[PDB]
Amino acid sequence: TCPFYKKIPGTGFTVDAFQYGVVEGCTAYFLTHFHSDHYAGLSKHFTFPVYCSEITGNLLKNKLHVQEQYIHPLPLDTECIVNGVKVVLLDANHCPGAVMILFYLPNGTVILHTGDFRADPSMERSLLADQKVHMLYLDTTYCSPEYTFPSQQEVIRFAINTAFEAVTLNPHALVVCGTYSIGKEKVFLAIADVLGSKVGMSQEKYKTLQCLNIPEINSLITTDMCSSLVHLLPMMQINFKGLQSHLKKCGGKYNQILAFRPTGWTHSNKFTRIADVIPQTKGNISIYGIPYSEHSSYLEMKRFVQWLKPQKIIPTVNVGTWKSRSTMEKYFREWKLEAGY
């Protein structure tokens, strides 16, 4: 049964609701972005209209083999009509093709669904500033004051300087970056740029990157794991045993691994700065866990909501326990009292 926080009242619309079969009354299925728990259930035998960004559309067509007749790509920052309802897609600052959706209901109410997002002040200068929002469906992944992490730009700076230093000292060192399906591409593309290298990867990952509208992408990537000093592996394999095994396959081209595991958050952030981050090392392999988040920090989330001043907030993450629900409700109340709305 599709839960209430994936349903848009006064429409036939759902959001990221593809693992429930045919939802009763749903005339259009919106997909905010191509991450697994959000698209889980889509396949080549889906027969209902999907509305999404152009990049998400490319991925549905090529990775999942969804028939072209069911993919409805919409441009960003543009007033569109879907089944008689005005909608706008906004960049979510999450992963390639990820959007937030504004719905303008027939009764005059306006709803913003954030999808997954990392809130930023630049969002204040989009079509969002043009009207009042009555309901907000909010990505509450890190809705607690202990979640601090640096900006993405500080984290990339750290990664670039670390990698450049290691390969300048040892020209036979290899850099490895852990990955999921999409998101955090800037980590490996920025490192490879400073090293003057292409990025080595699996055929399936190569195919994914071809779907993302990155300029000159086919010059930056390869499946040749011997003519590349930056390689991608599944996040699962970023550990001493997986990396030892990987070094064996490269055929005496490399004698050292520097690896990055670009997670969301690690509690070590609490009492330690980005300059202070130290690797785990065993012999010729070092592993850095870096807090490259594609979700809002507590403070980013707070500032966004206090600017928007919604009448009602519906959380879409951490909704499964009484404690979690209660804790989020308390923060929303503090935010409202502080700002005076």
Ligand SMILES: COc1ccc([C@H]2CC(C(=O)O)=NC(=O)N2)cc1
């Ligand atoms: C139930 O009421 C509260 C819940 C959380 C806090 C946090 C949050 C905060 C902030 O958001 O600036 N400032 C704090 O010092 N503590 C304060 C009151």
Ligand code: NI
């Ligand atoms: Ni996501």
